[PDB]
């Protein structure tokens, strides 16, 4: 197997190094900004850079260890970098577990919260969902708490893991499933979003 670090941090405009070992053959470096999206080769055959890749990306294999260097880091470089090589012992291709590059100096940003009550249409179908949309926050960690009037909600909560938006800030969603009867039997419901110790709360009421 190939060994590469889980994480690496670089300041904007600075330099970063990522090592990969485990093969006695040639190494490649593949950038992936989002899982499921096509990787982009930044380096192949130890030190070759494809035509469309900027000069700031360089590769160097010394002995049986590859080093991917980025000199003059930009915000768009934030990605997971996978190393790839030939497995001489087993005979197929192998990849490292991936290295997450974080570009430091990104300012903290509080979340915007939008909460919607159940639609009349869903209520007529004997269901009720409260929708809590959380966006534009950084760093990418929030805690979501739901309340029925002032009481904590114990069940029916489904929340996504935060994911980076196109503007480099995070978004997450939380859904509270209720019966129409529970929805109508409270004065209000609240979605409370905590980020870096500060909370943004939105409330909805049956109408």
């Amino acid at each position: 197997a190939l060994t590469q670090p889980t994480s690496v941090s670089a300041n904007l405009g600075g330099s970063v190094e990522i090592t990969c070992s485990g093969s006695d053959y040639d190494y490649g470096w593949y950038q992936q900004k989002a899982p499921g999206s096509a990787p982009v080769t930044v380096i192949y055959w130890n030190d070759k850079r494809p035509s469309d890749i900027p000069s700031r990306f360089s590769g160097s294999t010394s002995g049986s260890t590859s080093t991917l260097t980025i000199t003059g880091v930009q915000a768009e470089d934030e990605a997971v970098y996978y190393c790839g090589a030939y497995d001489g012992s087993a005979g197929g291709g192998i990849f490292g577990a991936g290295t997450t590059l974080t570009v430091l100096g990104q300012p903290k940003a509080a979340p915007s919260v939008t909460l919607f009550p159940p639609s009349s249409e869903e209520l007529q179908a004997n269901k009720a969902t409260l929708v809590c949309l959380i966006s534009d926050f950084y760093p990418g960690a929030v805690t979501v708490a739901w309340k029925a009037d002032s009481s904590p909600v114990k069940a029916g909560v489904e929340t996504t893991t935060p994911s980076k938006q196109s503007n480099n800030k995070y978004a997450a969603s939380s859904y509270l499933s209720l019966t129409p009867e529970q929805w109508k039997s409270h004065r209000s419901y609240s979605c409370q979003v905590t980020h870096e110790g500060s909370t943004v709360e939105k409330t909805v009421a049956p109408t």
Partner: peptide, 16 residues
Amino acid sequence: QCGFPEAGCIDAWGHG
């Protein structure tokens, strides 16, 4: 020059 298991020689990827 590059064999099929040479995972360090990739330059083009499909959309998936």
